[model samples]
Target: PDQFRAIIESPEGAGHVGYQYRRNTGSTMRMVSDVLDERVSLWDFHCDPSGNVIQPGPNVDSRQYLQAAIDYVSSNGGGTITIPAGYTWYLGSYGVGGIAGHSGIIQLRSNVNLNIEGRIHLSPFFDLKPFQVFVGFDNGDPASSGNLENCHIYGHGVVDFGGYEFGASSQLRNGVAFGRSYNCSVTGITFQNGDVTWAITLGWNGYGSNCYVRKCRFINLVNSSVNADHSTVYVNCPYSGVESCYFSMSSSFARNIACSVELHQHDTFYRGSTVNGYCRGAYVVMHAAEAAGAGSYAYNMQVENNIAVIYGQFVILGSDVTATVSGHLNDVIVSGNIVSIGERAAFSAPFGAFIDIGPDNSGASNVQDIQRVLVTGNSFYAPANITDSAAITLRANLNGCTFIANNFDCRYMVYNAPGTTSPVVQNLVWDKSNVIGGTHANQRAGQNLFDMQFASVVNSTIEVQLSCEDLSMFSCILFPASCQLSYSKITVDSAWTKSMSNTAVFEGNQQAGANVYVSYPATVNLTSYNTQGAVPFFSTDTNYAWVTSAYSLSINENLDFSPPATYTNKANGQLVGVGYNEIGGVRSVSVRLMLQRQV
Candidate 1:
């Protein structure tokens, strides 16, 4: 009578809830009341240290109790299966046969929460080892979706699959596979040592929409931390969000590929992976494509605030091929990330070369248009021992690409070896503001130029120079006057400073007042033009008139600056002018300036 009264109190109870109880319980009212009371107590039970219920006795087999609990929830539309606190339910090979045989979901109702205390090991028996999935929701078809949240499922022992013989390899895959689930979420989960395969996998064709996987840690994943392959979250679903998650891998060459907190279309706001360790293989954050000739575009995708220190290469491979053949990767943005390569001394290949983008068909018309690929505010630092062969590389038919406010501190020793095309660089910081020491050479078959540009200051340094046949080609001169006739003097202050009138330029074969002309065989010499005290002088009449046919100008000086104690002239002796002139017929010039200061 009470069960009927309680069921009729609720509207939906008339059809599905109370009537079933009435039909099941016949004339035995007292028996039915006792049974109903027990069931209700099971549903309302809370297990904690201070709670009324304590851990079951050691002889109590959790396998049978867990089955009873799950059966009760399934029968009554679903409820929580609480594993009392201070109790460990070490299940082994319990749900294996049922899962591999049939398709059904263990729906844990919102009111019911399963607390797996310590280790919950799966049986190593091959035929009976169940897939290490937390929930298997049965929605009548393989494409049906479900959710699991506010629950913790992990174990110290391996979800062992060593028994299955799918070949020589083990059949164990992921630690958890939440497949075909919409509005699904798993938060505050910790996964470690998923040595066989992925730590977490979310796949299938249905809309896995509005999922939130946050504050989760994936550690020591030998394969990958997360794998989301071949799934599309349509627009109609709620917005999916993944934030503040961390992943790390310690094994050599372990890669985390195609792993993201939220990966969907542009308007769908698919967020890319934000990892913080050595990821060996290529890692792709966000990727979406359409059928060939479908004209469907993957728009509005964003990858922001992530750090990836990769040992191999980090790549973003788009599916522009289908677009070129069919559609495009449209309106994608990759910004605010730090990507550094590990020290290459241990690697067999060049140390730190990366490919940011690959050929893909998703933007528009399949043409490789990384629309607005803004790589800004990033720092790339490599070791000093990196050779010319160990340089970072980027290959993208970059359309509308901008590299702004980035620092590239690279130190590599290079020479113009026999057969190698010079490195082609573009969009480099070439203003006098950021020039440093580096050699730029071209050794193509017919062209051989060895030019090394050393920074004169932090910002004001010479751009690259072009050299040919071991000589500075006239075409490679940047301020011809300074290039050919300018002479440098080492001041007593340990600074390189030189001042002159028209004489030094004229004697050095430089066109006076005219743009300095660089010619073959440039020569420089320091000498005294007068016997009196080394008086500085310059030839004011002839503009760059050569003193001799062989050399542009000559210098005559005495090594002894200790002035002869002769006449009574108490004047500080000044040094004479030196000739620095470019000679014709020579393609290169080399000169050294020496100076001494008397205390």
Candidate 2:
């Protein structure tokens, strides 16, 4: 009899390549093929390929077929599970039972990629022992160190988890929890309408590394569960980045959650983390050390070039290094971002600022925990209707933070850093509608410069008093009156006395000329109690002489005080000579000119 060759296919009539019929040694016909199919479809496991499949009550559990498809690929050293387009697949009845350890509905193994182009929805039914996660790595031990490397879930489709049946009191229902997965990435996906605790959590309970989540959209549906401590994405690991992503939440989600993107370090320091993109209606928080003594650090992190249209706050940098001094938050750069606060009802406590560092109202006694942070080149805008909105609020000890070249467009306060450490804040552009409170006197320790740009402030009532100790005349520029500028302890040096504004200070040492002293003369005012208020004498003479006067001050018709001034030193020095004569039985007054090196 001639041997017959038979073709083989999947039980669901889906075509799978590389399979043929062969005779065994016992004379029985057996199907022989490769170890596993390199690429398999979700429909191969008896899954509904149509979008109209209704999962009623606790009847249809589509997770069985999806799990079977993944298991067949991952069991044979990993492959791709292609979820075909134009279909909506349902999974599980409610959730998996026994919410302990690593319980998940679908367990993904190493090197298994879910290339989905359709929607995957988890059941909305309530379960007694609800599952903790929809997709995770391990389902056995919580302390297991098994890291599935190179497991990617990248596709342009939707992964919806429906709505919470229990409303605001739901348990810890996460969408996708990648626990301790190395070299894993989730890209080009949309996670919407999920009322779970978190949309995606990386490095939960264990430390994951080199994970990138990019080009994803996280949206909160209306009438969803809005509970406290809910977040869209939690990157609890080091060497991870969340870039080019869009996060949006409903108005109710603002009061329930504090942050949309949370770059947190729990056990160890999360170093080299980044969150750069777009966020609306939520805050982006970078936190380390859960409480006082938790002692974790988030170092070398960045949140850059993002647009945030939020109802609360934009960025928050927090640390608890006061309790544990070794756990410091440093080297953070938050730059090139546009932050706007929209008036959507009333905000929560502490209102909202453009950027806030550390706790609220920590007072002066709080130790320096966060340091070496730079917030530069950012534009902030808040409506006039939004009350209690500030540009930047520094509550904790920010020792070496630099806030430079930022524009503020608010009415309440521009920068509020009361009772904090010395932060170098300069080159800020303030709008016409701003009122910097008097408590800002203690917020400076370095050279504070302000370039107040008011378009047509010839008839406005905005009063901005820059009372910094190291205020330079060349650094602070104010427009023509209506709003006056009060200069306190102004330092007018040689570089500034030559020109009024925008003076060029050349490099290398140049000798001081005689005209440098005459440019700014010392004006001595002699006041008498008699009808005349005061008399002023302008002189540049360093030495005093009674006669041969070069200048004179006349009080009335009877009294005249003469003061002659000449440039004493014509070489490489600065000196002023003054000669005073007695007037109205007053003896004489001597004036001294002091010179200090600039820079």
Candidate 3:
């Protein structure tokens, strides 16, 4: 059942494959050029589907035929070029440079749909080229004005590179890149068997929009570096989505590292362009571009509903390279993801984590100061002993975050570095390491400012300690009826003192200024008081007090307490003392003790 039949054009050497169109008006026959919607098959151009003619760099260079077919369809006001299913079609002899520093085997044009049901393979010995791709649009070419739009590459086809040995540093290769193109999509494609950088590239030169990649599979891909981080899909465009895809690594880092997907603006065109978008339901790794400086940070991005099985760091945001200004990520969301530790056991402590929000201590002089990130409702799986590491790590540069309602089946839940402030944590479920053994019981070991709520502390031994010079607690509710709160303390210095009444001075480091006043039942003791030039006295109980007169009387002055005018000090450490002097003036003093309360 042929929708359209292929035909050879009159000028055979033109490399133009024509299609015979049958009109709906009672079997009227016409050429496809007369129709608005056009389609072409590679078989019409006499291209080999067997892939046999291109073993040792085909003398004929079959890319010319495929390229001519695509150019003809695109030139005829946009159409689909189909690669019919059968054997693989090998194309490209070497990298060919063209417009906008875009070098590839075939340069894609606007409004062209390349649909494939078979395999398209690039040569294994194809030499490296800058901005290289097997099939892609022109990269930053001024002639196109960076406005290439509405191209699509979708089908159950395999674009294989057959393990091309790409160079390590700047020399990179792409499977199908859309450079400076908008409203383009690559869906349901399988890119595999390549040791190349970026299996699919989107929107180069910082100018692309509405491009989407969905339901694709990236398998057996590896690379050493692209600024030390390669990717299967590198989206340099804004308003793009890489959703519901699958990525499986063939091997670990060839040298440095790589991710399944990366998002950022192009370095040369980093005009503060944001890679603002979402990546959902991917089964592997992802990141934003590690910043070289400050401008190329990702904004309003999300990594949600992904099942990440990572050997190294899974979801990383920030720079590994040393830059002048650090901490770049902002306003991101990482929620509803299930992260599992991979089978690679050599991955252990001192490394980053499953979700690393800052630079990974990979000698990174700078980290990304992420802000307003919400990590909620995710389940993390780690080994029983993650030796000196946590399932999720937050650097000191993180500003404000809420890590609530996440499930952890790992040794450690989070590692909040010191100076990380105002993180709200609540209602977490921890499965292992509950025993009071190691320093790995879902603890916050750093001196961070956090507010936490534990719903159930049954059979759990918890210890809470807050140490700060100026700390305030208002309307704090602690109801741990059946739980054990081991020890707690609030330490004060000798420089400050607090008194309830006006013109009252009590020595020995008293509490001052809106201190802890509890209305509870407890024993009150008045150790000693001051009677000017009276007899010396001391308390029989284990209580102590002092007196001073406007910085004149020494704290060690021998003072006496008079009978029937007894002083009272409450158990909550509010002390009041009054004494009569031989002079006309009366003297009063008070002492306040600071205590640590347990929850």
Candidate 4:
């Protein structure tokens, strides 16, 4: 489908797709015009052939152009503004040269897009060290206002606001501080090289409803990409759903707290300070001091598929305070992300856990019962020396937290402790089995292969067999060749009866003293048997040619046997039965057999 069709299907209409609809009717087109005003034509700034800035002439400054643009747009009843294509406009300090907040609404016109095709420098005299912002929207309500769109706002030079000079490093601040503005959408813009604070700071009773910082680039910002403070900081700003946004720190020696995004409530009156210093400092931090009810702070905030190359902790969900109050945080989801920390830092430390869930200051003992949190399919990797913590840590009682299919490759000391509860952890493994601590309890029902080292198991085989006859035997007896077989053979008479005629009749019963042979196939070895057991034999000699009822007397047979090697005959009749027998008798006869072969 087309862009318009797809957008119409969303909660926001087709105007989200850069098309002009009606603003009052909530048509995508009109909303575009009201959000984006026509301030480009009214402003005067230097432009190059490719729409970039080499240097803005002394006569025409970026601040003057921005102020003029803001004045023109606000006076025109809120319309979309257009920054003409093919030129670079440099933006200096807010009051020095660029636009400042006036009384009325300076809306961007629909169908008018501000394309920063060239480098829009944030400051001209780079050494002026004060809190410098590119755009400042003062005290506007989002529920009854317009938005900003299609403006390619980025800085080739450093956008610095001397935050370090103030020593209030933990204070939540930003490059663009929209103090008390509402119903504004900042879409389709690229912001880069923000210094000492947030790239975009929406502060103090400024409710941003349905406003989005979508498809933007936040680079080299010392603090967060987006930081908000106060109960009015945000009503429902989705977590990182600021989609398709990229944030990175500078390669220089200078480094800030390195948080990509942060949010907090202004607690000056209650705590007698601008911020509760103990519960401060997170890449993305949320506060409940303003909205102390069940669902007071940010909710339904979707932060999806955003990248954070944090030099410190990636995300801090809640604060760790000891106050006894009654407010709750709910419905937060963090999914599909890649977060990493420095190699020299301990993987499991106060600074490590990629995501930390602390206790709520609201004094609810059932803090563990807070559910509806889902963390799935993320990659967590750190170096060896970093130990003593988990990849994901939850100090609060997490009733329904779902952690599934996440890859954790930290040191042995790193573990996931749900703190006396069974939080779900499934399909997790180590590159080597021995690397993990104890067997993870959650691996019970998942598919686990002990031999992951082998790429494949085809073409392998094993076999085992015994080497004896009468395989039921377990031992064997040895005898010298000179030994004689006493009472070798015995025969039964015609009537199937044994005749005890005389002992001499059965003594080695051989007709002459010929060598009595007891032999078996060479394939069978007697010593190999595990047990000793004697074999039985039967012999017969015709008493008389049973012709005409001659006297047919029955004769019995008897014999004594020795081990299998060799024996001389005292006297043995023709051998009737001689073969190998297994060792261990009947017990060994029934043995379990196994064979394995692979092709």
- Residues 3-26 of candidate 3 have per-residue lDDT tens digits of 223324332322333344443565
For model 2, the stretches where C-alpha displacement exceeds 4 angstroms are 1-36, 47-59, 94-103, 126-133, 137-141, 165-170, 221-226, 255-258, 265-295, 321-326, 345-350, 360-368, 412-599
When summed lDDT is taken over every stretch of 10 residues in candidate 3, the lowest stretch is: 268-277
**lDDT: worst 10-residue window of model 1:** 494-503
Cα deviation in Å at residue 222, candidate 3? 1.3
Per-residue accuracy of model 2 over 398-501 as CA lDDT, tens digit each: 44455555666543333343333433222222332232332223232231223222212111122233322222333323222222222111122232122222
Candidate 2 local lDDT, residue 21 = 39
Q: After superposition, how far is residue 227 of candidate 4 from its true place, in Å?
A: 14
Residue 33 Cα positional deviation in candidate 4, in Å, after optimal superposition: 20
Give the alpha carbon lDDT tens digit for every residue of 1-599 in model 1. Answer: 78778776653353433223465656443433355543432324323334344344433334444655655655665444444444434333334333432221132322233434343333333232224434433333434334433333322223222323222233444444444445455455555543433444443322444545556666554532222221111221224444555667564435323232333333443234445444332322223332311134445555565666655444343434432342345455545556555555534433343233333333231234444444455444444444332122323333333444444443311122222222222222222122222222221222211121211111111122211121111122122121232221111111111221111122222322232222222223223244444333332223223221222222323243322111111123322243222221211122222222110
Q: Candidate 4's residue-wise lDDT over 504-583, tens digit each?
A: 12122221223221211111112213333555222223221111111112121212222222211113321222223444
> What does the lDDT come to for candidate 1?
0.35
For candidate 2, the C-alpha RMSD (Å) to the true structure equals 12.1
RMSD of each candidate relative to the true structure: 14.7, 12.1, 13.4, 25.2
What lDDT, from 0 to 1, does candidate 3 have? Answer: 0.48
Name the candidate that leads on lDDT: 2
